[PDB]
Every structure is written in C-alpha cells, then in structure tokens.
C-alpha cells in the first residue's frame, strides 16, 4: 500500500439511468468535440491560453451540432505527491464542468490525460508497480467524486499510453485493469458506467498488432476501445521540414497543387484512411465493441497566403469531412481535437473568448461528414 485507500464511501450498485450497453450508448453519438488545452493544461486550467470552461461554451458546442465532449483532465499536479490525494477544490471544479456538460445534454468523456507524463511515458516494468498504485488512488478519487452522474458520463482510463511492444502492452493491460477495478470498486452508478480503454499509443496499427483482450469487468458489455488519428503526420501536424520529410500543405482528391507539387501528399490519402479504420472495424466493432476516435484534426496553416492558402483550406476542410464520414461508416465515434487556438498551427473552431464560431468551414465539414448537414 504505497498510498491510502481512497475507496472511502463505496455505494450500493445502482443501475438507475445506466441502462444502455456500450453499443446502445455509441448509437447516440455521431460527433464529439475535445475541450483541448484546457482542463489538462499544466499550470492550471487557463495556463495554455484558454479560458475556464463555461456553461456558455458548452451550450455553443451543443447548439453547433456536437453530441458529446471529450474532456482531457490533468490530476497529478493537483495531488499531494506523498499521499496521492487530489485537491478537493479541483475535484469539485471537474464535477462542476461535468454537470454543465450534462445540463447541456452532452455526453461527456473524462480521462487522465498526458498529465505531465507519469503514466503515459512510463509503460515499463520498472514503473508498473508505482504507477498501478497512483492509477488506483486517482481513479478511486475521481470515480467516487463523479459517481452519481448518469450514463451521460463515461470514463477513459488513460490518454496515449506509450506502449511499444508486447512487454509494454502487458504493462498497459495492468494499468487498464487497475482503472476498471478502481471505478467498479466505488459502486453506485460506477458499477455499470461505460468505460473507455486505450490502445497502445492510441495508434491504430500498434493496437491491431498488440491488443489482446479488454480488462475483466463485473459489468456486461460496458466497455469501448479508443484510438486517435493524425495520419498523415506531414499534413495534420508537421510544422517544419526535416531531413526525413516535408510538410504537406494540401490533401484530398481535387485539392492538389499543380505548382508546388512537393507539398502534395506522398502517402496517407483516402484509401489509407479507409484501410486503417477497417482494421478497427474488424478488431472491435465487428466483435460488439464500439471504438471511440478520441482525437483527430488537421491544423490550419495560416502562414500560407493567396492561392496556396485557399487550396490548403479546401483540402483541410475535406480531410475533416472525410475522416468523420469514414469513421462513422465503420462504427468509430469521431471526436475533433480543438486546442482553442485561432492562430497559425491551431485547431480551434470556436473563439473561446466570445463563445462564437471562428472556423465555420471546418464546422460545416464536420457536420456534413456526420450527415447532420
């Protein structure tokens, strides 16, 4: 016992408001939005330039057409490092955000995010024991505090855990089992809450290769899998050229350049997207396990100008429409990664300071891709 038990008020199991299986719950979600660079920000909720989450933001998210939010959350920096006790004020703050999202009729996915790296970069035999202890202590606290929310609230145990081979995958499986066990131990509605488990690095190919089973669960058919998607890197995220490769500015059939053809993709186009999502359809969806596409987005390149900018924005928009549409077609639930930024190399579709739409072109792309428009 490195840390005290935080399973201090375990409750009678309660299935009130928790009647949906994972499959039934997934049917209710076609488009999600990540509250990025906010509650997981190192230094505090506003430390990465976004305002504190407001009811007004969550209202805008719902009214704009999203069914769900994924809320990355930081915890370690709020915790006593001797005892693993999380700040009561921070637990309450998280709870308040969850309540607002539910009040706006959104489904809500809470996680432990990168969180300074304590679990995420340490999927190793050397860290296994101490990290299982922290994973347990944190999840006991988070689940206890958020226990009374109905099925609008889902938990995700980890974010992008860095498991690179079969040995590290067994360590991740331990961490995921510790998560499910901690949640379930708290009882109440947590006996039946749908939980989301992350593939290795949330990478589709590594997950295909390394995944074995879901953690064992006392509940029936209450688990989903999670992967993320930023393929191809050169387009979605790459900010400078390297010896090994160039940034792609352009993407998608119809939106390629005839002049700067070195900025058209050399890989990662439509057929590759289909092939990757097909892997997750076979591995999970076809076995009765929904897949959360927990993050995707291709950043804006507003350092481009004139016709290059115009072309870039067209292919960027189409990329988001295409990923959304092809995900949904294969049982993957697409959650857009929004970092709140409206500047170069950002992904904010809302102006957080004014609760307005900044990037109507991407928003339209997502809604069209979801069949909402």
Residue numbers in the entry: 96 to 468
Publication passage describing the model:
The highly up-regulated CJA_3010 encodes a signal peptidase II lipoprotein signal peptide (predicted by LipoP 1.0), followed by a serine-rich linker and a GH5_4 catalytic module, and was thus predicted to be anchored extracellularly in the outer membrane by N-terminal cysteine lipidation. Indeed CjGH5D, CjGH5E, and CjGH5F all displayed high specific activity toward XyG. The limit-digest products further revealed that all C. japonicus GH5_4 enzymes specifically catalyze hydrolysis at the anomeric position of the unbranched glucose residues of the (galacto)XyG polysaccharide chain. The overall structure of CjGH5D (residues Gly96 to Gln468) is an (β/α)8 barrel as is typical for GH5 family members.
